[PDB]
Design an enzyme around this catalytic site. Structure first.
Site, PDB file in Angstrom:
ATOM      1  N   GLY A 185     -18.644   5.589  31.817  1.00  0.00           N
ATOM      2  CA  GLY A 185     -19.274   6.870  32.060  1.00  0.00           C
ATOM      3  C   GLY A 185     -18.769   7.613  33.273  1.00  0.00           C
ATOM      4  O   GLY A 185     -19.313   8.670  33.607  1.00  0.00           O
ATOM      5  N   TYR A 212     -17.092   4.229  37.571  1.00  0.00           N
ATOM      6  CA  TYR A 212     -16.025   3.429  38.163  1.00  0.00           C
ATOM      7  C   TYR A 212     -14.709   4.197  38.253  1.00  0.00           C
ATOM      8  O   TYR A 212     -13.653   3.591  38.458  1.00  0.00           O
ATOM      9  CB  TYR A 212     -15.836   2.135  37.367  1.00  0.00           C
ATOM     10  CG  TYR A 212     -17.116   1.342  37.216  1.00  0.00           C
ATOM     11  CD1 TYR A 212     -17.969   1.560  36.139  1.00  0.00           C
ATOM     12  CD2 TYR A 212     -17.486   0.390  38.161  1.00  0.00           C
ATOM     13  CE1 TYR A 212     -19.149   0.855  36.006  1.00  0.00           C
ATOM     14  CE2 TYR A 212     -18.668  -0.323  38.035  1.00  0.00           C
ATOM     15  CZ  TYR A 212     -19.494  -0.085  36.954  1.00  0.00           C
ATOM     16  OH  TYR A 212     -20.670  -0.789  36.816  1.00  0.00           O
ATOM     17  N   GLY A 213     -14.752   5.516  38.106  1.00  0.00           N
ATOM     18  CA  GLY A 213     -13.540   6.310  38.083  1.00  0.00           C
ATOM     19  C   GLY A 213     -13.129   6.654  36.669  1.00  0.00           C
ATOM     20  O   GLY A 213     -13.978   6.778  35.782  1.00  0.00           O
ATOM     21  N   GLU A 214     -11.834   6.811  36.440  1.00  0.00           N
ATOM     22  CA  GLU A 214     -11.300   7.053  35.102  1.00  0.00           C
ATOM     23  C   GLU A 214     -10.792   5.716  34.573  1.00  0.00           C
ATOM     24  O   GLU A 214      -9.723   5.247  34.968  1.00  0.00           O
ATOM     25  CB  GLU A 214     -10.201   8.110  35.137  1.00  0.00           C
ATOM     26  CG  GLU A 214      -9.605   8.466  33.784  1.00  0.00           C
ATOM     27  CD  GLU A 214     -10.371   9.566  33.065  1.00  0.00           C
ATOM     28  OE1 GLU A 214     -11.622   9.502  33.023  1.00  0.00           O
ATOM     29  OE2 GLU A 214      -9.712  10.499  32.538  1.00  0.00           O
ATOM     30  N   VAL A 215     -11.570   5.096  33.687  1.00  0.00           N
ATOM     31  CA  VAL A 215     -11.274   3.766  33.165  1.00  0.00           C
ATOM     32  C   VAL A 215     -11.127   3.862  31.653  1.00  0.00           C
ATOM     33  O   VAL A 215     -11.946   4.496  30.979  1.00  0.00           O
ATOM     34  CB  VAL A 215     -12.368   2.745  33.549  1.00  0.00           C
ATOM     35  CG1 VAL A 215     -12.084   1.381  32.924  1.00  0.00           C
ATOM     36  CG2 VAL A 215     -12.476   2.621  35.060  1.00  0.00           C
ATOM     37  N   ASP A 246     -19.611  -5.597  48.499  1.00  0.00           N
ATOM     38  CA  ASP A 246     -20.329  -4.654  47.641  1.00  0.00           C
ATOM     39  C   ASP A 246     -20.925  -5.389  46.445  1.00  0.00           C
ATOM     40  O   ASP A 246     -20.780  -4.975  45.295  1.00  0.00           O
ATOM     41  CB  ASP A 246     -19.416  -3.515  47.186  1.00  0.00           C
ATOM     42  CG  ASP A 246     -20.194  -2.288  46.737  1.00  0.00           C
ATOM     43  OD1 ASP A 246     -21.370  -2.145  47.138  1.00  0.00           O
ATOM     44  OD2 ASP A 246     -19.634  -1.474  45.967  1.00  0.00           O
TER      45      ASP A 246
HETATM   46  C1  LIG Z   1     -18.573   0.140  26.514  1.00  0.00           C
HETATM   47  N1  LIG Z   1     -18.559  -0.496  27.835  1.00  0.00           N
HETATM   48  C2  LIG Z   1     -18.681  -1.956  27.919  1.00  0.00           C
HETATM   49  C3  LIG Z   1     -18.426   0.275  28.943  1.00  0.00           C
HETATM   50  O1  LIG Z   1     -18.330   1.484  28.824  1.00  0.00           O
HETATM   51  C4  LIG Z   1     -18.403  -0.290  30.306  1.00  0.00           C
HETATM   52  C5  LIG Z   1     -19.479  -0.049  31.171  1.00  0.00           C
HETATM   53  N2  LIG Z   1     -20.562   0.696  30.722  1.00  0.00           N
HETATM   54  C6  LIG Z   1     -19.456  -0.559  32.466  1.00  0.00           C
HETATM   55  C7  LIG Z   1     -18.373  -1.296  32.895  1.00  0.00           C
HETATM   56  C8  LIG Z   1     -17.275  -1.530  32.055  1.00  0.00           C
HETATM   57  C9  LIG Z   1     -16.115  -2.327  32.547  1.00  0.00           C
HETATM   58  C10 LIG Z   1     -15.645  -3.421  31.826  1.00  0.00           C
HETATM   59  N3  LIG Z   1     -14.620  -4.121  32.262  1.00  0.00           N
HETATM   60  C11 LIG Z   1     -13.978  -3.839  33.396  1.00  0.00           C
HETATM   61  C12 LIG Z   1     -14.380  -2.757  34.173  1.00  0.00           C
HETATM   62  C13 LIG Z   1     -15.456  -1.996  33.749  1.00  0.00           C
HETATM   63 CL1  LIG Z   1     -15.970  -0.644  34.711  1.00  0.00          CL
HETATM   64  C14 LIG Z   1     -13.483  -2.691  35.391  1.00  0.00           C
HETATM   65  C15 LIG Z   1     -14.280  -3.045  36.665  1.00  0.00           C
HETATM   66  C16 LIG Z   1     -14.475  -1.719  37.438  1.00  0.00           C
HETATM   67  C17 LIG Z   1     -13.203  -0.928  37.103  1.00  0.00           C
HETATM   68  O2  LIG Z   1     -12.192  -1.303  38.039  1.00  0.00           O
HETATM   69  C18 LIG Z   1     -12.825  -1.323  35.656  1.00  0.00           C
HETATM   70  C19 LIG Z   1     -12.419  -3.761  35.143  1.00  0.00           C
HETATM   71  N4  LIG Z   1     -12.896  -4.497  33.967  1.00  0.00           N
HETATM   72  C20 LIG Z   1     -17.299  -1.022  30.758  1.00  0.00           C
HETATM   73  F1  LIG Z   1     -16.274  -1.232  29.906  1.00  0.00           F
END
Ligand SMILES: CN(C)C(=O)c1c(N)ccc(-c2cnc3c(c2Cl)[C@@]2(CC[C@@H](O)C2)CN3)c1F
Ligand SMILES: CN(C)C(=O)c1c(N)ccc(-c2cnc3c(c2Cl)[C@@]2(CC[C@@H](O)C2)CN3)c1F
EC number: 2.7.11.1
Lengths: 291, 285
Positions: free
Chosen positions: A23, A26-29, A135
């Protein structure tokens, strides 16, 4: 430069981008699929224009690429392509614990115990490397589709490492300065035991859906923590939680860092060494999320 | 913005004479009201840290702190007008005269402690006490100077606070570092201990060791505070003054007001006539 091991190539030559994740918190992921294995990864994209500061991003990659522990999000390298940095990391398909309890409501004590053990395992490893997460919170504890637990987001930790390097680079001649001034400039003024306090707060967060004093102005909360008579927080509902959980909170939230148990010591606590803590407990939580 | 800024031409009010300080303290001129002498530091207007530095000097009103008179803005140049200290810094002095006598050091130390006790009760920290920042006027009187380091630290403390993020998960020691910086005004007491050694030996301890090595040592906890090099040259009171001002633990280091009761700086015969004697040496040597 940002990192000496960066892949100077287009990430899209290796991954198909599937959908945005998180959303924007965490930035643009991006969720992405490896074109040869089919494995899933998360790609965080950060802008890297020619004259931006790279120091914090450099510290973040340095932290990530020297971690190899099950309870830390795995690192697969970074891609620099047309002034965009793509950080490739392990994909945690259930999102963060905050994403989950915002739907399910409060976690059971056993689910909180499993989570706490897994974070403590990750923290013991980080502390054994002389790293500090700094954090720890529900938003930075990720969960995969198997119910496993992964610490993520070293952005704050990288922020502080970058401060440490700058303030040290321009500290000036030290022959007149007091030892405690040199120590704050080199070490920061606290140690890895701040992570143990943050886990205590995170345990309350999982039990009650907000950290203590969430509805108090943040500068007022900071000021209250510096007063001599400051009292560590406690769980709200006494009868809902066992004495073991209450004691877990009491010792992790030890006010004096000189007396706060380390992560290895906390792993021996009754709450996280009890039997029956396994990823099935979080699969139950994910099933509730689903039902 | 500083509400007392004089928005007028300073050369309409002062004759600019020579430069002073060799550029160590910036671009600062010796000026004569156009018969009083002042120091005028000019800075190009590109600045919140420069703002904060002037506010420190402006709000300080103590005889042992260099006096502030005002600031002029003109042609994107800011002219800070201050009390002129005609004998320079103590470093300027001892580089010519050699090491100060114990009585001279004791008087300088009393005068600096008086300024520090004022500063610390104003909730300020100098953080760069040293011979180069202790100035002497033609009457042999002692004035603390150069709050630039104090302004930069206070600006770093404020800015890092504005990007600290939500604090609900922070440990109280991390909160304390964010709000207060991790150390306190007693660091100035230690710096004065080093300065007294500097005045006695023409160099701070460990001056001939690489600075990053000295930073490495000071944080090792096995670290031993320095001492006077030549025991028999100095009285037990001086040695004890060095011992207490160089207390390693900030929890035990005496305050400026407490140090003013130490035997070394409370003995009789401490007066500006001692520095007049010193100023005679630099003139006659
Ligand atoms: C449909 N889903 C599950 C998502 O949208 C969802 C979500 N709501 C919250 C978190 C993640 C997530 C999952 N894996 C990750 C990461 C994130 Cl943020 C990172 C860690 C922070 C950033 O560096 C990228 C690396 N690995 C999601 F994918
Ligand atoms: C021929 N002499 C004596 C000098 O050249 C000389 C010198 N070697 C060293 C210091 C001073 C001096 C004297 N009074 C001052 C200042 C300074 Cl620097 C300030 C203090 C803070 C700084 O910003 C301007 C204001 N009051 C000198 F004038």
């Amino acid at each position: 430069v940002v990192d000496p091991d960066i892949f100077n190539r287009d990430p899209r030559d290796h991954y198909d981008l599937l959908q945005r994740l998180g959303g924007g918190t965490y930035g643009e992921v991006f969720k992405a699929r490896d074109k040869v294995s089919g494995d899933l990864v998360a790609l965080k994209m950060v802008k890297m224009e020619p004259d931006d500061d790279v120091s914090t991003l450099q510290k973040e990659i340095l932290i990530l690429k020297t971690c190899r522990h099950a309870n830390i999000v795995a690192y697969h390298g970074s891609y620099l392509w047309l002034q965009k940095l793509w950080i490739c990391m392990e994909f945690c398909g259930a999102g963060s614990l905050q994403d989950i309890y915002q739907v399910t409501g409060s976690l059971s004590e056993l689910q909180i115990s499993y989570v706490c053990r897994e974070v403590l395992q990750g923290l013991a490893y980080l502390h054994s490397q002389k790293k500090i997460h700094r954090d720890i919170k529900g938003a930075n504890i990720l969960i995969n589709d198997a119910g496993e637990v992964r610490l993520a987001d070293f952005g704050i930790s990288a922020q502080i490492g970058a401060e440490l390097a700058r303030r040290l680079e321009f500290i000036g001649t030290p022959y007149w300065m007091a030892p405690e001034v040199a120590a704050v400039a080199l070490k920061g003024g606290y140690n890895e035991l701040c992570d143990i306090w943050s886990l205590g707060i995170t345990a309350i967060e999982l039990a009650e859906l907000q950290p203590p004093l969430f509805d108090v102005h943040p500068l007022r909360v900071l000021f209250l923590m510096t007063k001599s008579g400051y009292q560590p927080p406690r769980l709200k509902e006494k009868g809902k939680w066992s004495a073991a959980f209450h004691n877990f909170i009491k010792v992790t939230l030890t006010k004096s860092p000189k007396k706060r148990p380390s992560a290895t010591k906390m792993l021996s606590h009754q709450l996280v060494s009890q039997p029956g803590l396994n990823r099935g407990l979080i699969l139950d939580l994910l099933d509730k999320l689903k039902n």
